Amino acid sequence: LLSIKEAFRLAQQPHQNQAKLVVALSRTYRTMDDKTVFHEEFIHYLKYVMVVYKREPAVERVIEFAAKFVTSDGGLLNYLFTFLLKSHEANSNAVRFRVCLLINKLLGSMPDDVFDKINKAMLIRLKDKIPNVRIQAVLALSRLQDPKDDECPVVNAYATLIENDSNPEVRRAVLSCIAPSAKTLPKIVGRTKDVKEAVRKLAYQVLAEKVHMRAMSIAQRVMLLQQGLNDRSDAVKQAMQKHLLQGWLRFSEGNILELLHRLDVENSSEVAVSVLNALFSITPLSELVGLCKIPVETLTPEIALYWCALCEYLKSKGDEGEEFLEQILPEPVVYADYLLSYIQSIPGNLMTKEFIGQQLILIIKSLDEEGGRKKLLAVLQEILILPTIPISLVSFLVERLLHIIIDDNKRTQIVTEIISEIRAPIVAETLQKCLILCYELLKQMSISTGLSATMNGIIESLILPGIISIHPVVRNLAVLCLGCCGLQNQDFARKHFVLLLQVLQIDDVTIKISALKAIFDQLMTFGIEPFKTTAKNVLKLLSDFLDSEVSELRTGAAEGLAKLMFSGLLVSSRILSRLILLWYNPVTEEDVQLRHCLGVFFPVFAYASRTNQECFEEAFLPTLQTLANAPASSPLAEIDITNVAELLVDLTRPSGALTVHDNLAMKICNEILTSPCSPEIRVYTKALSSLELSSHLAKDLLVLLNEILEQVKDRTCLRALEKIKIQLEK
Amino acid sequence: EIDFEDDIDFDVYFRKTKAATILTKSQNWRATTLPTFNYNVDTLVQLHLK
C-alpha cells in the first residue's frame, strides 16, 4: 500500500495533491491491524521534520500533511499529542519549536487530561529562550483562553507578554490572539503606542474587529482617534481610519452625526474636527450636506460643530463646494439675525449653549455684498453691546467683526463706539468685555498705523486705568494691551516700559506672565539698549525669575532670555551659565516647556557662530565652579559635573588661527595648574582629553601638559594626561 | 529536500539537558512603548502677543 514514508516523501514535493495522499494513507491506516504499529511509524518519520528550525518549504509541507492527515489503546491523534507533550523540553531549539508548531496546527485543525497537559506545557513554553518557540506557544494556547473566568492563566500570560516581551513578533502574536475582556482591553489599546509600527497597525484592527464600540470609554475613543490620526506613519493612520473609524462610523449606520454624539464633541472638538475632515475627504458632498435639511434652530453641539466644520470645508473645495455651500448657508445678513436670536437665550448650567454659540459665531467666516457687511457688523456690534452675554463669546465675536472691516482706523472706531456703549450705565466683567475688544484689536493691527490718536484715547481712558483696577481680571488684559501698544510706538514703549517692570514684581502672578510676554516681545523688537538711556537693571529683573518658584515664570524668564540670545540681542556668559544650570537643575524636571525649549536652543545657538560658542567657552569655568561650590542643600549639588562639562565641550567643538577648543585647552590647563589636586581634577582632565586641539597649539600645549604631569597627583588623571602627551608628540 | 531513508538517531535532538526557558530575572513596557512634546526653533524667534 502507501507507506507513511512514501506519503511523507510525496508531501515533500511542491506540486503534489494532499487531499489525495490523505485518502491513500488513510486507508493504509485503517487497513492495518493493531494500529499501534502505525502509530509508532508515524512519529518516527515525523521526527525528520521536527529537527529543522529553518522554514524550508519541504519541511513545512510534511508538517501540514501530517497535521492535516491526523485531524481529518488510544490513537492516533492522541498518540501524537502524547508524543509532542513529552518532547516539548527537548534540548534542540528546532524540536521545541516544531512541537509547539504541531500542537498549534493540531489544535487548529481538529473537530481527557490532554487539554490540561497542553495548556500546562504551552504555558511553560511562553517563557522559551527562543522567541519563535514562544510565538508558537502563544498561538497554541490561543484556543485555550477563557475571558469569563477571571484571572485565566492564558489571558494573564498574554497580559504580561503583550507588553513585556523583548520581541515585537511575540507581542504582535499575543495581540492577535488576546480575547477582548475588561482587564485585557487596556493592554490591547495600549499597543497603539507600541514601538513597532506593525504592532500599532494591528492594534487598530483587533480593536475595530474584536471589540465593541461600547466597551470603550468616550475618553478612549478620542485617544484612539486622535493618536492614530497623527501617528508617525501613514500605514498606522490608514489602519485606524480604515478599520476603526469607518468601523465606528458603521455602527452609526454610516451616519456622521450619530458618531459625533459618541465622541463627546463639546470638550474634545479639535479632535472631532480632524475626524470630520478625515471623514469628509472620503464621502461625496451631496451626502455630507444632506445631514442638514437654511438653519434649523433647535440643535445639539454635535449638530452645530458639524455644520460649522462642513461650511469651512465646503469653502475650501473652491468651486464645487460653492454650489453645496450655498445649499446650507443663507446670505450673510439673514445669518446675523439668526446669530443674534440665539445669544439672547442666555442668562441647569448650559455651558452647552456657550459652545454651540461659538460654533455659529465661527460660521461667520464662511459667508461673504457691501450692504451685507454693514448688517453683519450691525448685529455683531449689537451682540457685543448687549450685556448678559458671556465673555467666552466676546473674543470670538470681536475677531469675526474685525476680520471684515479691512481698515485699521475703521476698526478702532467701530470698537470705540462699542466700548463707550458698554461704559454708559454704571461691573468688572464690563471692563473685561471692553479690554477683550482692545486686545483683539491691537493684536490684529499692523505696525504701520501705530497708535492712532483715537487709540491714545482708549489707552488713556481704558487701558492705563485698567492697570490699577481693583479687579485682577482687569489688570491682566490691561497689561497685555499696554504691551501691544508699546509694540506700535517705540517712544510709547519707553515711557511705560518702566511701568511694565513694576507689574512684574509687585502684581499678581498671572499678570506677571503677561508682563513677561510684554517685556520680552518689546526687548525682542527694540533691543535692550533703548531702555537704558529709567530701567538700567532690566536684565537683572528678568534673570532673577529663573530662580522663581513658579513654573510659568521660570519658563517665561528662561525662554525669553533664550530668545534674546538667539537673535544676538543679548550677550551674557553669566545668564547663559544660569541657563545651562537651570536646565540641569532637578527643580526643573517637571517643567516640560522649559527643559524642552533650552534643549533646542543650546545646540542651535552654539553652532550658529563662533561668537556664540565663545559665549559658552567664557561660561565654562564659572559653570563648573558654581557646581563645585554648591552646598549639600541646593539641588545643584545633585547635578553631575561631568555631564555638564561634556555638553560644553560638545557645543564648542570646531566641527560645528587658534580655535575655541584651543582657548579652552588653555583655560583648562591654567585651571588644572592652579589647583592640580582639586576635587574636580578628574572632570577637567576628561574635558582636556576630549577637546579638538589644533595642530600648531601642540608645542605650547606640550609645555603646559608637562608641568601638569608634575603637579597632578591623582594617578588616574596622570595616565590620561600621559596619553594626551603621546598624541601631541605625534 | 528531506531524506527519510537513513536511520538517524534523533535522540541527540529530543534528549533533555539545560536550560530551556529564559531566566526568572528577565523587563518593562518602557522598552516596547513610545514616549509621548514639540518645540520648533521658530518659536524662539516668535512673539507672545501676536
Residue numbers in the entry:
A (entry chain B): 7 to 78, 92 to 130, 137 to 318, 326 to 379, 393 to 413, 416 to 473, 478, 554 to 659, ...
B (entry chain A): 460 to 485, 490 to 499, 501 to 514
Sentences from the paper on this structure:
Condensin I is a multi‐protein complex that plays an essential role in mitotic chromosome assembly and segregation in eukaryotes. It is composed of five subunits: two SMC (SMC2 and SMC4), a kleisin (CAP‐H), and two HEAT‐repeat (CAP‐D2 and CAP‐G) subunits. SMC2 and SMC4 dimerize through their hinge domains to form a V‐shaped heterodimer, and CAP‐H, which belongs to the kleisin family of proteins, bridges SMC head domains through its C‐ and N‐terminal regions. CAP‐D2 and CAP‐G, both of which are composed of arrays of short amphiphilic helices known as HEAT repeats, bind to the central region of CAP‐H 4, 5.
As the most C‐terminally located motif V was predicted to bind to SMC2 21, we thought that motif IV (residues 461–503) may be responsible for binding to hCAP‐G. With this information, we aimed to express and purify hCAP‐G complexed with a fragment of hCAP‐H. We found that the N‐terminal domain of hCAP‐G (residues 1–478) connected to the C‐terminal domain of hCAP‐G (residues 554–900), and a fragment of hCAP‐H containing motif IV (residues 460–515) was able to be co‐expressed and co‐purified. This hCAP‐G‐H subcomplex was successfully crystalized and its structure was determined at 3.0 Å resolution. Two molecules of the hCAP‐G‐H subcomplex are present in the crystallographic asymmetric unit. Their structures are essentially identical, but 4‐(2‐hydroxyethyl)‐1‐piperazineethanesulfonic acid (HEPES) is bound to only one of the two molecules. In the current report, we describe the HEPES‐bound hCAP‐G‐H subcomplex (a, b‐molecules) as a representative structure. Consistent with the recent assignment based on its amino acid sequence 5, hCAP‐G displays a “harp‐shaped” structure composed of 19 HEAT repeats (H1‐H19), in which H12 and H15 have long disordered loops (residues 479–553 and 661–691, respectively). hCAP‐H, which comprises three α‐helices (α2, α3′, and α4), binds to the concave surfaces of hCAP‐G. Second, hCAP‐H is more loosely bound to hCAP‐G than the yeast counterpart, resulting in the more opened conformation of the HEAT‐repeat subunit hCAP‐G. The distance between R257 and V754 of hCAP‐G is 17.06 Å, whereas the corresponding distance between R287 and F749 of YCG1 is 6.25 Å. The previous electron microscopy study also demonstrated that the HEAT‐repeat subunit of cohesin loader, Scc2, adopted several flexible conformations. These observations of the structural flexibility led us to speculate that our hCAP‐G‐H structure represents a snapshot of an “open conformation”, whereas the structure of its yeast counterpart represents a snapshot of a “closed conformation”. hCAP‐H interacts extensively with the concave surface of hCAP‐G at four major sites, whereas YCG1 interacts with BRN1 at five major sites 17. At site IV, there are notable hydrogen bonds formed between H512 and L513 of hCAP‐H and D647 of hCAP‐G.
